[PDB]
């Protein structure tokens with residue numbers, strides 16, 4: 375089976391909706407954040423809320439519900455965190471994992487550049503190819519769902535291949551034609 379990672383900035387919304395959805399379809403999936411820290415917004419000429427990666431979703435929830443339970447349920451982050459709590463203990467940060475994947479999917483260009491920069495600045499002697507794909511998804515609950523569909527549909531297609539390194543270029547193109555999207559693609563090595 376393919377090992378897949380899905381990566382946004384904070385590992386709270388887009389990467390976690392896609393996480394949920396890929397796992398519910400049977401995929402081997404982990405998810406990560408490329409930011410320095412996790413941030414979540416609140417009254418928005420305010421400084422948002424910040425927590426180190428490795429902080430539990432449960433405690434973040436608890437920290438916001440005791441800050442203004444109504445506010446954070448209206449803007450749907452209590453919901454979001456409740457949902458995340460059930461998948462895994464805490465947001466994880468991509469530049470500190472040592473997990474290895476066949477495909478890492480980023481949801482925006484800044485994340486895509488942080489991932490590719492990060493792996494280039496490594497290097498070992500596995501020489502094993504990992505494919506980094508960007509599939510743009512907008513950062514709100516609604517588009518996180520829609521983006522999870524599009525991501526799952528693409529993985530589902532790549533998971534048919536028994537020779538992914540030689541098929542992938544061509545699958546990317548069919549998919550781009552059929553969903554009318556641009557998929558950035560890098561090949562990196564572990």
Ligand code: VO4
Pocket residue numbers: 382383384385386387388389407513
């Ligand atoms: O946790 V992510 O907000 O960058 O969708």
